[PDB]
């Protein structure tokens, strides 16, 4: 019954990063991972010592729920637009074997097909902001659910913009008609020190996305548990 395992996209400074850890430790979170933005613009490879959370945090994550220490993981988010950049992921898989759970962000439906079948990742980043044309096809979804591949839905609609509220709820329901809810997680990015929600608050926010009446609670608990369970055998 490992509950409230979500991921954050957060690096600017150690003061803003530790504030999100202490806030997530306050609410319900027992597994908090930090994502890294890697794109085709700068083409940087910082894999070996990106943050070193265990060498900077003061050794005591304490929650007020189960009262257990937090397993802090390191995850990677690769923004892929061109198929020439997708071949970089197949080259760094044997050079540096870190970043236990790998998440990729596709943009083309031809590249989305090889991401669900041929590309060896763990989660799929699906964010549609400010008129991003990307339609969903049913055979690449039906292979990824049998493989065990998950799909992300990263939201932050409540603070920045009101126009961005509509693209997060409309692009979600285009996926709900096809995927049916076999492995769907809903994490949230946080740049400001207060851009996170409560542990039981996600259970209605998944029902706000629709998708279920009871299994939306399992989208933050059960489907998030399968990310570390499937990604552990990929590393070893």
């Amino acid at each position: 019954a490992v509950f409230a395992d979500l991921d954050l996209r957060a690096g600017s400074d150690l003061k803003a990063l530790r504030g999100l850890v202490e806030t997530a430790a306050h609410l319900g979170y027992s597994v908090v991972a930090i994502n890294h933005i890697v794109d085709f613009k700068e083409k940087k490879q910082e894999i070996e010592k990106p943050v070193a959370v265990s060498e900077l945090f003061t050794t005591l994550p304490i929650v007020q729920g189960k009262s257990r220490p937090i397993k802090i993981l390191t995850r990677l988010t690769i923004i892929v637009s061109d198929p020439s950049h997708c071949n970089v992921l197949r080259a760094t898989s044997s050079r540096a074997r870190l970043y236990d759970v790998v998440a990729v962000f596709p943009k083309t439906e031809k590249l989305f097909h090889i991401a669900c079948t041929h590309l060896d990742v763990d989660l799929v980043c699906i964010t549609v902001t400010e008129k991003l044309p990307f339609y969903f096809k049913r055979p690449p979804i039906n292979v990824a659910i049998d493989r065990g591949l998950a799909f992300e839905l990263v939201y932050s609609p409540a603070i920045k913009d009101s126009t961005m509220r509509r693209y997060t709820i409309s692009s979600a329901l285009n996926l709900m008609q096809i995927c049916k809810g076999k492995n769907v997680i809903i994490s949230s990015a946080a740049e400001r020190p207060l851009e996170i929600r409560g542990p039981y608050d996600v259970a209605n926010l998944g029902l706000l996305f629709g998708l279920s009446e009871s299994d939306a609670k399992a989208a933050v608990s059960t489907n998030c548990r399968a990310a570390l369970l499937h990604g552990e055998t990929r590393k070893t």
Binding site: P157, A158, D201, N204, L207
Partner: peptide, 12 residues
Amino acid sequence: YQLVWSALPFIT
């Protein structure tokens, strides 16, 4: 109850 409890994350 599902309308109030879903409006709680959008209070800023």
